[PDB]
Amino acid sequence: MSFDINWRLNDLIRKHLNSYLQNTQLPSYVSNLRVLDFDLGKVGPAITLKEITDPLDEFYDSIREEAPNDIQFLLEVEYKGDLLVTIGADLVLNYPVEKFMTLPVKLSISDIGLHSLCIVACLSKQLFLSFLCDVSDPALDDNQTVLDPKGPILAATKPLERISIVRSMKIETEIGEQYQGQGSVLRSVGELEQFLFTIFKDFLRKELAWPSWINL
């Protein structure tokens, strides 16, 4: 019973991600970060229902502070969809001098691979969405439920020992003709690509990964 899903949101994600970026301290090699475009795409995840339970008490606890009869789905989610983020960056070349040059440059984050247990909780009628952990996370080996609150995943006491939710991700960069020869530029671009990779994964973890969640 592994029955699919396919599908303003894009603009909301764009402005939020933009805020995140504008609130990030930048290395010497990048002057400016901005989201040129965000696109969730046309292709969605393969969804398998794993279990269905009462919502986690942590949700109720959250509501009781600021924000009965309700429901929660434990889902296995397998994503190899067509999400695309296009980010504008001002690459700073420091090879000769400091701030020798600035190249407007555009990076493309694409081809996101994901295979993870998430949860979707209806609590009348706020909606909670959170990615718990990757499918092949070692904390699932001893063959016990994820929804165990005293268990490793939900307790979130050892974030280091968690497998990354994002399995794969592709970053490309568009630079000028003129710079494809110079190794210094290529190196700076590499550094920027790595930095943006870690930044984006960080953002996703802070927005979607348990104990964080998307609240509606």
Swiss-Prot record:
What InterPro entries does this protein's entry cite?
A: Mdm12, SMP_LBD
Q: Where is this cross-link: Glycyl lysine isopeptide (Lys-Gly) (interchain with G-Cter in ubiquitin)?
A: K42
What are the GO cellular component annotations?
endoplasmic reticulum membrane; ERMES complex
Listed GO molecular functions?
Answer: lipid binding
Judging by the UniProt lineage, the source's domain of life is Eukaryota
Which PROSITE patterns would you find in this protein's record? SMP
UniProt keywords (A-Z) are: Endoplasmic reticulum, Isopeptide bond, Lipid transport, Lipid-binding, Membrane, Mitochondrion, Mitochondrion outer membrane, Transport, Ubl conjugation
The compartments listed are:
Mitochondrion outer membrane; Endoplasmic reticulum membrane
Tell me how this protein sits in the membrane.
Answer: Peripheral membrane protein
Q: Name one GO biological process term.
A: mitochondrion-endoplasmic reticulum membrane tethering
User: Per the record's keyword annotation, is Membrane included, yes or no?
Assistant: yes
Key word Transcription present:
no
Where's the SMP-LTD domain? 1-216
* Domain notes for this protein: The SMP-LTD domain is a barrel-like domain that can bind various types of glycerophospholipids in its interior and mediate their transfer between two adjacent bilayers.
The record's subunit annotation is: Component of the ER-mitochondria encounter structure (ERMES) or MDM complex, composed of MMM1, MDM10, MDM12 and MDM34. A MMM1 homodimer associates with one molecule of MDM12 on each side in a pairwise head-to-tail manner, and the SMP-LTD domains of MMM1 and MDM12 generate a continuous hydrophobic tunnel for phospholipid trafficking. Interacts with PUF3.
Family, according to the entry, reads as follows:
Belongs to the MDM12 family.
Role summary: Component of the ERMES/MDM complex, which serves as a molecular tether to connect the endoplasmic reticulum (ER) and mitochondria. Components of this complex are involved in the control of mitochondrial shape and protein biogenesis, and function in nonvesicular lipid trafficking between the ER and mitochondria. MDM12 is required for the interaction of the ER-resident membrane protein MMM1 and the outer mitochondrial membrane-resident beta-barrel protein MDM10.
Which protein is depicted?
A: Mitochondrial distribution and morphology protein 12
Identify the taxonomic lineage of the organism of origin.
Answer: Eukaryota, Fungi, Dikarya, Ascomycota, Saccharomycotina
